[model samples]
Target: DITIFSENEYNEIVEMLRDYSNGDNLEFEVSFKNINYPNFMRITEHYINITPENKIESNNYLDISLIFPDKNVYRVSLFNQEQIGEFITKFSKASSNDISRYIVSLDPSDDIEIVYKNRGSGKLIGIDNWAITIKSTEEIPLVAKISKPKITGSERIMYRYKTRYSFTINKNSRIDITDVKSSPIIWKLMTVPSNYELELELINKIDINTLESELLNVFMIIQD
Candidate 1:
């Protein structure tokens, strides 16, 4: 069985497991969230499609393989702006005779990176609401240094169009996130849920403390 834990609490739980099992058959895996490329689709929009043959002659560029959820694969090349538009127009009119699928090369220009949109035509056709998975040799570079935006007291409102919960965490508040096997405090403001409004609650409320402690104890038991 797989157990879930917060990144911090997992450290202690893992130590306990190591001691209990004496390092025999005690395997642990750590997966950190990629702060860079928080949105994958945004990275793809900064490039244009190119043929595989031409990629061998290209300069200082990265290649990424784009895969649809259904297993269709398209190789894309990341390139600078001066040469990208011609390639986009070529791929836009590509036919099966020359190449079945072409790859787009991305360039990280300020305007291209900031304003690019990769959403498809808002039509209900064969491939509406398309999603892309990029397979790249190099870690996709972050568009800019990660910044913690200042949280103003103005209440932010979120409306759910298709999902279930909508949540916002205020600045400088401690967030306690717990799962089946662990609990940890999150110091960053994270927006979660999809359809529900989350009011900012005091971190020291008696009822909230009771619920938090109870949940942590339950998760500890399950972890054991």
Candidate 2:
């Protein structure tokens, strides 16, 4: 399983793992695990099945559970650049925080809700490669500039019509795919012969590190 921990937290866990490895001549390896479920229980089951059975001699096993703040839940729908523009025009006046909140509140049947509105404000600039700024109003100042939405080649498409989504500290802040409610929206768009349509339920209010680590785990599952 891709262990999600802050840098310091990760370091502490690694140190413990190393301590457990000492004198046993066992090599420590971290593998990312992918499982499909809305909660951690499913992931734990998969982890137990696939992970090696060897037990570390350490007296204690650290159990760290990461919790996403309730406020950070928002639904984001992925759309073509045109649709994105339309959505922005519709919801630009909303605050970044509120935009994120709105997304998580959507039910499965909602037509299309704008959950997360990332303005790319101040020091939190959007990456250039994945996103392009189309237009800026005082309300919604940051927009994606690219006319065509291109999935980065790095992702491995698993289910038909599914595409890998990523968010890194790269050129433009790319929207993390797992941040959306549905993982297969991009793939659904690609199955059509004509231009594709992508919609995601975005939750943008979590801490960046938590978001990144959770996404990495999701991507690892997609690749698996």
Candidate 3:
């Protein structure tokens, strides 16, 4: 089972992001900003900022994101070239094969509700990539980003539809598959678990047809 990105991996990721900023030809115009927290970092300056087109928040700045030193993802928004750099940094780990290039098309955190459904054969796939063993949990902010909803090839995406859902994991999971399309929409339940991380899984079977309508609408119960 894939586990949380350890400290070693996190440092590797930091250097990886740094490389993009100072690569051979400067693949990205990027710089890291130190946050109030000693260990945490803020990607404050970047070449791209998708502000004018963003529906997430005008004040938040499309180019900003946070990495809490653990977890699968942080904030995702319309990025300038630099922002996209971080986008791939997180999701590449999602694909786990070092496969790059993601056509992320939607941010459902702006939604009102995140609901899961049994549309097809009703299969679920759980991921075990978190460092926590979520004993019991409830989220106040569950965000999911849908794919570009297009074709993938020299695009190197490996699939057309996928979502990178994020929230506090008491303990959790990537995810990858061929033509695997979108990974499933996951929610912790009063379900049995051999492990606490990928608390979600295929209760019955595994099918790749992730319900975009369902997962995109998934969110926290609290309105705050």
Candidate 2 runs further than 4 Å off: 1-202
- Provide the lDDT at 3 for model 2: 37
Alpha-carbon TM-score of each model against the true structure: 0.20, 0.19, 0.16
lDDT of 2 by residue, 103-144 (tens): 333333233323222223211222233221112111121122
Deviation in Å, model 1, residue 13 alpha carbon = 11
Point to the candidate with the largest lDDT.
2
Question: What would the per-residue lDDT of candidate 1 be over residues 1-224, giving only the tens digit for each residue?
Answer: 32234454435443443342342222221111221222222222211122233222213222223433333333333344443445434543443322222322233454323211122311111111111111111122235443222222221211111111111122212222111111111111023321221111222222323323433432332231
Each model's C-alpha lDDT? 0.26, 0.30, 0.24
Can you write out model 3's per-residue Cα lDDT over 1-224, one digit (the tens) per residue? 32234565445434544443342322211111111221111111110132222311212113212212222122333424454345545554354222322323334444222222112311122223422121111112334543222223222221112122222111111111111122221111112221111112111211222311112222111012
Q: What is the lDDT of residue 25 in candidate 1?
A: 24
Clashes of 2: 27
The better-scoring model by lDDT among 2 and 3 is: 2
Ranking by lDDT: 2, 1, 3
> Where does model 1 exceed 4 Å of error?
1-74, 95-224
